[PDB]
């Protein structure tokens, strides 16, 4: 089994202060709702990706499914800000989070899993139909469902997701229904 | 064992549905409630059911009967809980000084 | 009135040691008790605190005396906040 990435959240400093009204009026697919939130929400189409551009020149880029695709979408957002007229430098690009999900191909019985690992797992069925297991060494949060689908979140690199899944796989096989 | 693991599964996974208690409370208030009210009110009523069944199985163990719960152990459960003030009735103006 | 808690309450009685197959009359008594408890709590909550509004704060003051129920409300609220933070 391999976990495929579903969501990459990155951040990039453009270095130049922006007034948001000209970007909202000139650029396409740009949504600005200040009485609601203080950023410009611009979406692109080729890589299905969304950017929140802030007035201090920092940009949050969400939605891509690899590191190179997130970097390429961030470059596209920087050049569409640039060609409007602002002098925009690609100062620092950092990926805040990487999210992956996988299916372990059998039903899982969660009551023994909270019974034997109650130090790291918080499970409340009514609030959410999933078990939050916190791995202490990778620093990942895993939502483990009864149907067999596991969602790994809270990672910076890919190898952390891979090592967390290889860590939590023998426990899940030990607790098969 | 193999029944204790099934019983512990039903002790945790069972809940009253939030789509009906939000319909039930709003028929008493008149206008609207919030999600953090319905989350708490669905949780207290599970403790209150667990206050009765854990005490109605004390009535059945006191008398000479088995685990199936007849209503005799359930009217006696509300009687013993009310004498310890656990069951609140806001229609009986009580008076302690006589 | 119909029974809005017929199948849900049978899982809960099994959760506290009754049987896998309880009696319909016992399930009916439990359902009536739950509806009465919810109604009483809602009236007292409307009286206490903001008149005509039932809030979490009012519900918490009402359940303060009973230890088992107060602990459950606090745990559920804290866990809800934690799950929202994780999301």
């Amino acid at each position: 089994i391999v976990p495929q990435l579903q969501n990459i959240v990155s951040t990039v400093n453009l270095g130049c202060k922006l007034d948001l009204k000209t970007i909202a009026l000139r650029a396409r697919n740009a949504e600005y709702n200040p009485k609601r939130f203080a950023a410009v929400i611009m979406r692109i189409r080729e890589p299905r990706t969304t950017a929140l551009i802030f007035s201090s020149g920092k940009m949050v880029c969400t939605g891509a499914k690899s590191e190179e695709q997130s970097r390429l979408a961030a470059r596209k957002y920087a050049r569409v800000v640039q060609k409007l007229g602002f002098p925009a430098k690609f100062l620092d690009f950092k990926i805040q989070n990487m999210v992956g999900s996988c299916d372990v191909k059998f039903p899982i019985r969660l009551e023994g899993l909270v019974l034997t690992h109650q130090q790291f797992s918080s499970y409340e069925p009514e609030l959410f139909p999933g078990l939050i297991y916190r791995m202490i060494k990778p620093r990942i949060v895993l939502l483990i469902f009864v149907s067999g689908k596991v969602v790994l979140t809270g990672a910076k690199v890919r190898a952390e997701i891979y090592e967390a899944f290889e860590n939590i796989y023998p426990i899940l096989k030990g607790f098969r229904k | 064992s193999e029944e204790q693991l099934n019983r512990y599964e039903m002790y945790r996974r069972s809940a009253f549905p939030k789509a009906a208690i939000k319909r039930l409370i709003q028929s008493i208030t008149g206008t609207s409630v919030s999600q953090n009210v319905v989350i708490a009110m669905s949780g207290i009523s599970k403790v209150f059911v667990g206050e009765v069944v854990e005490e109605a199985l004390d009535v059945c163990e006191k008398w000479g009967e088995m685990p199936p719960l007849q209503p005799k152990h359930m009217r006696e459960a509300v009687r013993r809980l009310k004498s310890k003030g656990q069951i609140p009735n806001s229609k009986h103006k009580k008076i302690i000084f006589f | 009135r119909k029974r809005l808690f017929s199948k849900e309450l049978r899982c809960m009685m099994y959760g506290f040691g009754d049987d896998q197959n309880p009696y319909t009359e016992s399930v009916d008594i439990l359902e009536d008790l739950v509806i009465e408890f919810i109604t009483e709590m809602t009236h007292k909550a409307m009286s206490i605190g903001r008149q005509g509004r039932v809030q979490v704060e009012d519900i918490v003051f009402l359940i303060r005396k009973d230890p088992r129920k107060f602990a459950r409300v606090k745990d559920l609220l804290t866990m809800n906040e934690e799950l929202k933070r994780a999301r």
């Binding site: 999900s101 999933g130 | - | 899982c11 197959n21 009696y23």
Partner: peptide, 26 residues
Amino acid sequence: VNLSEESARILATNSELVGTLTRSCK
């Protein structure tokens, strides 16, 4: 989408195991 379909699977097994036959009492 994962939260929407998995919520009803905690309750679907709560109608297959418990309460198979319906009883009554005098």
